[PDB]
Amino acid sequence: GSMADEALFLLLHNEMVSGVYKSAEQGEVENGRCITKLENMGFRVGQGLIERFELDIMKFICKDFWTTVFKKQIDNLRTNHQGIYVLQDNKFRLLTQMEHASKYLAFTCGLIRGGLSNLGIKSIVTAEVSSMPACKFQVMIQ
Amino acid sequence: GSMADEALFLLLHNEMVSGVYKSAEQGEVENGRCITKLENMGFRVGQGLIERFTKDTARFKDELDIMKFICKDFWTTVFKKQIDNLRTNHQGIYVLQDNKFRLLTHASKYLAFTCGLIRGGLSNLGIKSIVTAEVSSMPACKFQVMIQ
């Protein structure tokens, strides 16, 4: 049912994170490589999802794209300035089992960046836990 | 749409397989450790999914009912379709045929996690099993479940 459907990505993400950290070579946690691994995997998956489907583009990230991955829409899309958006998820699926949380946000930052890349957009995407398990993703167009 | 909905799993599985093999240490391909990693990851995900289905007496009644659940509700969770054919000898061997296995649309590395999935699912339903797989005629695949 929906409960199992809503767990599938969390379970797979948990394996990705655990395995990247467990399998890290000497110095790769400390030098940021575990992070780039997670962001780069997210990028490829984001690209791939797009292949199966500026403000209009961002609402699609917030709605159809978020719903595919997380079974719900983004709670709030805000943009204060040309080229920078804040996407707020009030109960971020991947944190529902809890600086040390950043590793659980990296893959998703990549997902958003990859989806945008294949729509012709260069971006930087960062994230922070607002109040566990709420999260804000900051999308910065380049 | 549904095209994307099926796709998420395939894409994540591609990443898992790629990563295990890219990250493999000296001797881990040859000694079978890449395969056990993928089976073990699948086992854990399969267990986790079981925990998210509602249980009652009649669900998972007899062994064949548990097997039909694996073929239907469980398979659909992951692959967005059911197993095409379930065969048993009723003496502990089941063969699950997927005529168009979505991860295929060297084979071993692409079946390991799914073997693990099945086993972990069954484990959390009280069943000890060994699960093996082969490509019958690409992209058709057969999963053999042997109840211990």
The CATH topology of chain A: Muramoyl-pentapeptide Carboxypeptidase, domain 2
Number of strands of chain A: 4
Main sheet strand line-up of chain A: 1-2-4-3
Name the pair of protein chains with the most residues at their interface, and give those residue counts: A-B, 26 and 28 residues
Give the oligomeric state: homodimer
- How many helices of chain A? The count is 4
- The radius of gyration over CA of chain A amounts to 15 Å
Instruction: Name the helicity range of chain A.
Output: 40-55%
- Per DSSP, what share of the residues of chain A sits in E-state strands of 2 or more residues? 15-25%
Report the CATH C-level class of chain A: Alpha Beta
Tally of discrete structural domains of chain A: 1
The CATH architecture of chain A comes to: 2-Layer Sandwich
Order of helices and strands of chain A: HHHEEHEE
Structural class of chain A: alpha+beta
CATH-level-4 superfamily name of chain A = Trafficking protein particle complex subunit 3
Give the termini separation of chain A: 40 Å
Secondary structure layout plus pairing:
The structure is a homodimer.
Chain A: H1 2-22, H2 33-50, H3 55-70, E1 76-81, E2 84-89, H4 106-117, E3 123-129, E4 135-141
Antiparallel strand pairs in A: 1-2, 2-4, 3-4
Keywords (chain A): Disease variant, Endoplasmic reticulum, Epilepsy, Golgi apparatus, Intellectual disability, Neurogenesis
InterPro entries (chain A): NO_sig/Golgi_transp_ligand-bd (IPR024096), TRAPP_component (IPR007194), TRAPPC6/Trs33 (IPR037992)
Family (chain A): Belongs to the TRAPP small subunits family. BET3 subfamily.
